[PDB]
Amino acid sequence: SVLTGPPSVSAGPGQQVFISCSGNSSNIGNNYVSWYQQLPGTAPKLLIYDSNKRPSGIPDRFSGSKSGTSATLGITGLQTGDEADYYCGTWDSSLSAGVFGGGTKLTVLGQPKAAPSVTLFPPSSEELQANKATLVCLISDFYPGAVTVAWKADSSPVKGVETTTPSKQSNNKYAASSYLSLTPEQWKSHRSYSCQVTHEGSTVEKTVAPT
Amino acid sequence: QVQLLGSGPGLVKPSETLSLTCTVSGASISSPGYYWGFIRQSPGKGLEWIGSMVSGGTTYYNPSLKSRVTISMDMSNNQFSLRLNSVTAADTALYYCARGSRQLVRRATIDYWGQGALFTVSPASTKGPSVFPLAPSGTAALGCLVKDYFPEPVTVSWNSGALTSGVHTFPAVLQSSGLYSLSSVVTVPSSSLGTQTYICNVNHKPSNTKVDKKVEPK
Numbered sequence: 241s242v243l244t245g246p247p248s249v250s251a252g253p254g255q256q257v258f259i260s261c262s263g264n265s266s267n268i269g270n271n272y273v274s275w276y277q278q279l280p281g282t283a284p285k286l287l288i289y290d291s292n293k294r295p296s297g298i299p300d301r302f303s304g305s306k307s308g309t310s311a312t313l314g315i316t317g318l319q320t321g322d323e324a325d326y327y328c329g330t331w332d333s334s335l336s337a338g339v340f341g342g343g344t345k346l347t348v349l350g351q352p353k354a355a356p357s358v359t360l361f362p363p364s365s366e367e368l369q370a371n372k373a374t375l376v377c378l379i380s381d382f383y384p385g386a387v388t389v390a391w392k393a394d395s396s397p398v399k400g401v402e403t404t405t406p407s408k409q410s411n412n413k414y415a416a417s418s419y420l421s422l423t424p425e426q427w428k429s430h431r432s433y434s435c436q437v438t439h440e441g442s443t444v445e446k447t448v449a450p451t
Numbered sequence: 452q453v454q455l456l457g458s459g460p461g462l463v464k465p466s467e468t469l470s471l472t473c474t475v476s477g478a479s480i481s482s483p484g485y486y487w488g489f490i491r492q493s494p495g496k497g498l499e500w501i502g503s504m505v506s507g508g509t510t511y512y513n514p515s516l517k518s519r520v521t522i523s524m525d526m527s528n529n530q531f532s533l534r535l536n537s538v539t540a541a542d543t544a545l546y547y548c549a550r551g552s553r554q555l556v557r558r559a560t561i562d563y564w565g566q567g568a569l570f571t572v573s574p575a576s577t578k579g580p581s582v583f584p585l586a587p588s589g590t591a592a593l594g595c596l597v598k599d600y601f602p603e604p605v606t607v608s609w610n611s612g613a614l615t616s617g618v619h620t621f622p623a624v625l626q627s628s629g630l631y632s633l634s635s636v637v638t639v640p641s642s643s644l645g646t647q648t649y650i651c652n653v654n655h656k657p658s659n660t661k662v663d664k665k666v667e668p669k
């Protein structure tokens with residue numbers, strides 16, 4: 241990295257935010273600057289080129305500026321959809337190469353709490369016929385993005401549990417999943433299995449049974 | 452209508468050569484006025500410029516990678532390619548085919564990014580997934596479970612891409628055995644089960660394998 245900038249930035253909805261990138265005469269000082277937006281799980285998208293111009297389809301809320309050896313992406317009237325990673329880019333005369341800044345994550349303040357939607361699937365008959373059993377606990381649309389998952393077979397099982405870290409969704413909420421690997425004999429030997437999802441002082445438990 | 456299509460995600464063994472080919476549609480790769488290049492991004496990290504060829508003109512390289520990269524163009528097939536040699540696990544990344552317009556020098560702006568393709572540098576062999584249906588039991592959730600594959604990614608569509616409202620394809624879990632699993636679930640009207648067929652299409656390009664599974668009520 242040859243450009244410097246804030247690793248993360250927050251603001252409220254409706255406000256205006258600045259994202260700065262700093263360099264020197266070999267890059268930002270004497271060359272054109274571009275800005276890119278990257279939403280979760282997608283390729284970057286160009287927002288600003290030639291330091292202050294907007295491609296077609298980029299709303300007027302996004303602006304770009306350059307002073308000295310720093311460039312600035314402005315976002316007036318912040319929206320919940322602006323939540324994203326933002327990257328500045330330019331040409332470096334010393335390197336004779338394009339260069340990127342480290343990136344700035346942008347989070348919009350004041351998002352309401354959302355309880356997780358939990359769906360639990362028992363093993364399918366085809367998997368049982370392959371002599372395996374997997375219980376699948378899918379957790380979506382919760383905010384903030386911190387959850388804990390526990391499993392029960394009437395009592396607490398911890399072996400065979402694999403759970404993902406939460407990942408941001410397109411609507412700015414989070415999702416996670418947990419799997420419980422059993423043998424067919426273990427699955428049929430208990431009255432029920434449960435997935436328990438704890439989020440912000442409340443728990444949601446879903447139960448399945450072989451019968 | 453100018454499109455870029457890469458040769459897809461892949462496994463590369465350590466010390467071997469990472470090869471990525473991008474095919475251009477809707478324009479000729481020889482035409483001046485565009486430049487074509489490569490960018491990479493580690494899965495939770497930042498963007499790194501690799502290099503770019505100005506059509507009709509000069510090729511430019513990240514000085515940190517230049518000594519093990521070759522960027523080339525094949526105009527007959529309207530393609531351009533990246534060779535990254537002597538790879539190690541640090542080279543695991545999303546690799547993007549990229550396009551820019553007008554002059555590259557002093558600008559370097561990318562106005563069109565390809566989809567991005569994960570290249571995983573690992574000495575473990577590829578393994579295609581086993582797919583199991585998650586039967587449904589005013590809406591119903593049904594899905595399929597994609598177990599025990601390597602490397603990432605698996606992509607899942609429903610009904611050959613026709614269905615995507617209510618589709619949620621979850622991030623993969625990395626098992627302690629070093630294989631991945633994921634699930635994809637779609638929420639559909641309950642009244643639709645019995646007349647509407649639901650089929651998940653699970654593409655594991657790294658093993659050149661696709662599995663389609665019809666998911667029916669219990």
Ligand SMILES: *[C@@H]1O[C@H](CO)[C@@H](O[C@@H]2O[C@H](CO)[C@@H](O[C@@H]3O[C@H](CO)[C@@H](O)[C@H](O)[C@@H]3O)[C@H](O)[C@H]2NC(C)=O)[C@H](O)[C@H]1NC(C)=O
Pocket residue numbers: 242263264265266
């Ligand atoms: C414009 O900014 C760049 C980026 O900082 C400047 O290049 C950098 O110059 C510094 C200071 O001389 C280099 O310092 C060195 O850091 C490396 C570790 O990266 C260390 O191994 C060396 O012993 C030394 O402390 C730095 O690497 C270098 N970065 C490059 C060349 O990419 C550039 O000098 C600035 N230009 C002007 C006109 O100020």
